[PDB]
Design a protein around this ligand. Sequence first.
Ligand code: GTP
Ligand code: MG
Ligand code: MG
Ligand code: MG
Ligand code: MG
Ligand code: MG
Ligand code: MG
Ligand code: MG
Ligand code: MG
Ligand code: MG
Ligand code: MG
Ligand code: MG
Ligand code: MG
Ligand code: MG
Ligand code: MG
Ligand code: MG
Ligand code: MG
Ligand code: MG
Lengths: 82, 85, 205, 704
Amino acid sequence: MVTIRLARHGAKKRPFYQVVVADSRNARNGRFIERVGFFNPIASEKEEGTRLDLDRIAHWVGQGATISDRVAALIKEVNKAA
Amino acid sequence: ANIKSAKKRAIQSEKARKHNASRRSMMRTFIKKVYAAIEAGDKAAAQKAFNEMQPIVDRQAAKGLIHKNKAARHKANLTAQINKL
Amino acid sequence: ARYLGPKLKLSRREGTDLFLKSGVRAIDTKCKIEQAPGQHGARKPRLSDYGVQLREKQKVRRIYGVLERQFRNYYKEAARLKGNTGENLLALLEGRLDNVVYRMGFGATRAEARQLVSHKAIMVNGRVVNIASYQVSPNDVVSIREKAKKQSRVKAALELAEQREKPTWLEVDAGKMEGTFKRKPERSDLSADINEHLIVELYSK
Amino acid sequence: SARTTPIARYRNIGISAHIDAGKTTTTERILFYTGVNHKIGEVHDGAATMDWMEQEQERGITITSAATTAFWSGMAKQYEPHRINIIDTPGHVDFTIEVERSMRVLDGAVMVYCAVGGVQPQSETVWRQANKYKVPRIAFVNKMDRMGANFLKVVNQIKTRLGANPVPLQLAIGAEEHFTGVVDLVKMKAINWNDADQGVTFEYEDIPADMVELANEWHQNLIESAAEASEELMEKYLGGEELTEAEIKGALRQRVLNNEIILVTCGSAFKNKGVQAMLDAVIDYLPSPVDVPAINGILDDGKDTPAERHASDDEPFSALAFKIATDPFVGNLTFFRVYSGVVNSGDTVLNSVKAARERFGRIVQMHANKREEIKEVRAGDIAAAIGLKDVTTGDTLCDPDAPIILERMEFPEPVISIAVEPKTKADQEKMGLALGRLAKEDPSFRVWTDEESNQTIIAGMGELHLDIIVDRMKREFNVEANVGKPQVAYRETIRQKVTDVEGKHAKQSGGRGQYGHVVIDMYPLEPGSNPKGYEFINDIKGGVIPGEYIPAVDKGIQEQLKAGPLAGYPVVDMGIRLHFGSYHDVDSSELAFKLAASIAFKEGFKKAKPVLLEPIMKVEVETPEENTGDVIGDLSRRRGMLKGQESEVTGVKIHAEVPLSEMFGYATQLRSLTKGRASYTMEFLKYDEAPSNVAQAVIEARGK
RNA sequence: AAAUUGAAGAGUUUGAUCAUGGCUCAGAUUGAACGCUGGCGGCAGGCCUAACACAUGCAAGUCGAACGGUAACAGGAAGAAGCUUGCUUCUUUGCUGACGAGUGGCGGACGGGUGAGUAAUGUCUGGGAAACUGCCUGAUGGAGGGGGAUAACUACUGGAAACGGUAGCUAAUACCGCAUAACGUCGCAAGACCAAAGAGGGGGACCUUCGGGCCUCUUGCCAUCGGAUGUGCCCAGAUGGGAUUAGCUAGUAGGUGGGGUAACGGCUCACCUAGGCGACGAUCCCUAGCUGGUCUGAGAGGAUGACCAGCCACACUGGAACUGAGACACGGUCCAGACUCCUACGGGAGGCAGCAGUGGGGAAUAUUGCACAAUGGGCGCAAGCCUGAUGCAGCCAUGCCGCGUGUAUGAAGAAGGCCUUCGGGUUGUAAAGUACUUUCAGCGGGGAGGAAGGGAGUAAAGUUAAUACCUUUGCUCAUUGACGUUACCCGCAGAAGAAGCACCGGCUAACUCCGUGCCAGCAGCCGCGGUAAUACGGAGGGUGCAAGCGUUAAUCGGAAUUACUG
Ligand SMILES: Nc1nc2c(ncn2[C@@H]2O[C@H](COP(=O)(O)OP(=O)(O)OP(=O)(O)O)[C@@H](O)[C@H]2O)c(=O)[nH]1
Ligand SMILES: [Mg+2]
Ligand SMILES: [Mg+2]
Ligand SMILES: [Mg+2]
Ligand SMILES: [Mg+2]
Ligand SMILES: [Mg+2]
Ligand SMILES: [Mg+2]
Ligand SMILES: [Mg+2]
Ligand SMILES: [Mg+2]
Ligand SMILES: [Mg+2]
Ligand SMILES: [Mg+2]
Ligand SMILES: [Mg+2]
Ligand SMILES: [Mg+2]
Ligand SMILES: [Mg+2]
Ligand SMILES: [Mg+2]
Ligand SMILES: [Mg+2]
Ligand SMILES: [Mg+2]
Ligand SMILES: [Mg+2]
């Protein structure tokens, strides 16, 4: 089905997870429908490490998309800290 | 085969082939019966054969043998042929 | 990645004092600047137009201590930027950390300044920077680590720096032995014997 | 990952004998009786399992040493299943390296002997190879069904011909057609194997009356050699209280481990008799791996420090690589016998002599050729390894925490040489790679090249060794090659002091011609006069030939020296004097005088007395004394002169100087004259003039 | 505000000149190779050739919360007693923790690989209608009543193996009717017809044949209408070379009707019409995966399709279908062909263009590595398990980038070498010496981040008959890292262990000596070498680069030398 997961771009030992909406049958860094945010686990304490477009994410949930565990934890963290 | 799951699918696909072939043969046998009643020139036996055939193709379209559109086309062409006689 | 040979041969080939030595001694008492290095150095030949463009590029490369690959990258960055290409090239060369350390006066030569910035002795905004090609942005703080503030090299270099002309785009303070980079220097703030148009001409053929 | 078989129940036995003594037959029978094979396959039918290689099924011989294992419990299953890693080694003299490598690592041996001919030329060779490494050995008199089988004669002959202390634990019930079974001397029962089944059923019986007298005579001989072991057992024998069967077997076992007794048995492997009893004696008398600890006299320091390893799992890992085989899929294959410790498939170890890291790709237990992949090997078993890139025979493999270096034995220095060439010759470096890989498998097989001939010289232990090598290269490596005589290097020299020979090269036809004239004297030079036998004298005085062109004639002679006008052999010991010449001012070049000096040199060579020099090599043959003069006669048939003949107590040593062209293939000829128990050595000595027939022979072939 | 600010020529025809005209070079660039040399690090890249053949290991399994069940080990009860009454040993009990084999469900149609074929059942762009769509979702509703088998299992038995053959027994969310039928199908119309499967958690009194019913919760099942996603289909335009390929096509082009597909359609068949395409290049031949892009060029153009991403096609070769929502299916089936392997000779088995790796080919391209810690994927309620995807590590100067191999002082301008018109000049502040520094490497210590979660206890809220069970939300507890001796930081030692390659006649930055004497040889072009060679070889010196330097190959540029710009 259509899911919202993380595509691991970036450099070696320096990841960067593009929060993308895609069908689960495609690859991780492969064909995606829409990029709805990004996540950086090595953010540098002064600037933005996570950004989610919650309107389109909620719109895709209304269409019936599946949120993975890391993306669901990031949505929780965004809705909690802000 | 090589993978354990591959061998299990192989024997299951042969079992379903036997079952689906019997059901497809039975469904096709009823349909030909309606067609023979068309070409022979009878209207009540063709109507009786259609009433024996209609629940057959509906159950085969229901449980997953053929599609509903295929069963729908069979009924539509044969009623269009009972209105010709 | 560095030239490790005799340094006065470079100034003898360029025919100009490239400040490759401290200057505590008069340069004519060290080498014959008016004579080129080698056996046939007394005969001064008629250089071509390609010859004088190449000599200008090697002169500015041997003043700033930059090899050809890094100097080519500096030329591509200067032409990529807006405005004058040669003036942008001079500003990128003077933005280097070893050049700023030498111009601030913590090194008597730019090579010694390179050894000071290579041996973890210069802190940029409170952070140790170990790369001589670190481009210093305007309104920055360049300081000496507390581990090496008691060295004779840095105070001797500051004495030679107060013996020479002070740059106008830098502030120094020998008390705390730190300083401030204020802005990118214009073309009028550096030496006038460098024809930077020859460098741009050379990199166009 | 526990111990499957206790290390005390291991037996690293192996078979070595003379050719066709019955080594492969016994092993085949063992496997069948122990249950590894389900059928009996004969070796002359090509169906024996041990001779897995082609050219072993076809020829009917064994070339390689194949290692298998089996589990034997005894006839009446008197003990738990012992594990025997039996090894069949070839008996031929062309494969002595395959014995020495296998007897580097064997804990026990057994010397099988033909009953009708006991101690044959190679029986003594494998005996000396076995006592080099002090291997405890048993004896199995095979072929007791053969016509003229004599068991008590061969037990006399092993003692007499080889100097040993054999005491039989068996006595043959019958001869060629009477060999129903054998009577055991430690039990006083008769074992008669049933003919119906392939000898699987063995019936116990009493002894017949003639055999009663003879077996009673030999049984007391067994007790004395048992009582020799300790003074407690000596006082036991003179004390008159018979002896328990456990103490004879214990005492006899004690004497076997110290190389004191031989414990001869008998049997007939082709008639499926007396094989089960041999296996029992291997259980009862051959050592376990736990017996003698491996003294590794090097601790990898460079300061040579004696250490050792006992045989247990809890010790550091130490193993010895004793056989490298080639493989078309995995590269090479490395046999090893673990002395101590446990290693896993995937663990890294230390090639201690090459001082390199070595990981184990996988570890396979070996049958004759097929492999069973296993997880890890304990201390005291033999297995092969895939994925060792640079391991030679005799290298030790140990854990890098305890780097030790074992003895690193020496190789027998091959004795015969041929020159090999490809059929189509496009397969030149394929043959080079193939013989390089085959040289890494066999350390007694040498390959090199000689750029004097630009040839490839294969060397081995016999002509059969080289025939197997070239046939294995054709099948396995697909390089079909033809062999032949290695080209002997000759030299040529002149005599008669030819003088005033003038050669002039003039080519002026208009437009920069070349002109040179030279008159020179060619004189034979004594060898000690110059480091190189070439002296050029500038007798030219006051012009005539300009100084600049004086070296040009010298260089021209030097190229002429490299290839002789007669044939192509290099000229040696030549003195040249340039007394007179002529020079044109505008047409005289370096090359003009080179052509001029070459015309003159050729003209002088024919006028002078030009002869070939063959090389003569110093030859030292060592032979038995009974067939001394035949060796000398063959030496006189090989056009060789003689400088002496020493007669040691071990054998006669004859010295000679034989020409190299008549030293081609001497080893097979020397073995034919001497029952194959002679050896020799060649060293190049000098050059000497050839007779007229052989000089006339080498000129016709080279010229055309 | 900023998003392109961009364009060099030289040599060579002649006695000399101008013009034309080819040839050659200076520049970028690469999945490169070779020669010499070689310190470290980061990032990236790495069979371009034989879609040549492949040993071995691994690459797709999961679910006991679907079912009959115990074969293995871990408990609980009868249980003789190992017995030392606690020392827990020997026999039954599927009694439960679980779980081999088996039925069943889902996934194996994804991920991964390759570019053989395909000049169009392809791709790209823009459109369209005649359709299907598992898992994921929204809404409306049902989930009643039965039956016949059969695997496993039991007994016999053929087989060397692969595998079976008989005769009986049994279960289900396996299978098959019947009941029900509409906003579904067919029929304008009355009418006719069509489905299902249960399983777990807990419980208060009831109630009971003692198994349970019963109530509540979770999950699954069926039907219809949708949504989303995926896919099928159609049209237009664009997408190589060849005219020394000019005519091609009879299911061909169209109509009628039947059949067929999920769907329109010559998709198929019967009949009828005789059309259809084509110099706007049909047909035929050769070549070729296409694109986003990449390289070059000032631009227009030219060249290209490595890595990454999208689509397509292929899975030993040829053909075919089955199962399935989805395949005509890389690690499924069937047949034929070639090849390989096994065999007891009677028979069997297999497809690395998955990851490693081997042989072969070649100028040349790497490890038979670690871990599921993270990101995903499959299955499962979940724990969890599987994952050669992936994350990493190993090898290679293959590329890019960064850094180092010291810094300051130092004239007797030391010695030696080279040149010398013998005065000297040069190597050359170079060296030595004096002082200072310790980056990188070496040694030792400290030490992030990639970790989100998940599991146990809790408290609250929802739930209901219940203060159980379940869901959600906060707290506490002990934990999850292959990389990894991680990045990073500190400290000890001493300049300490760290520079080569090409070139020097013009193009083109750099000149002399010696040797050679149209010889050896050099060379990209002009050309050089016959005795004073700045062109050959050595030396000194210098120049240009630098852990790289040159050569070769290849594309573009210069070439306005196919000129649309021009
Ligand atoms: N009559 C008889 N013939 C035997 C016996 N044992 C072996 N043979 C025959 O001798 C030949 C066997 O000798 P092998 O043992 O195979 O040769 P080998 O001793 O193994 O050693 P290599 O030749 O070096 O490989 C065959 O022909 C056997 O049939 C025996 O006991 N009795
Ligand atoms: Mg660099
Ligand atoms: Mg014989
Ligand atoms: Mg023979
Ligand atoms: Mg043999
Ligand atoms: Mg390829
Ligand atoms: Mg399905
Ligand atoms: Mg119904
Ligand atoms: Mg192609
Ligand atoms: Mg252009
Ligand atoms: Mg598949
Ligand atoms: Mg495969
Ligand atoms: Mg592979
Ligand atoms: Mg697995
Ligand atoms: Mg001097
Ligand atoms: Mg360090
Ligand atoms: Mg962490
Ligand atoms: Mg052009």
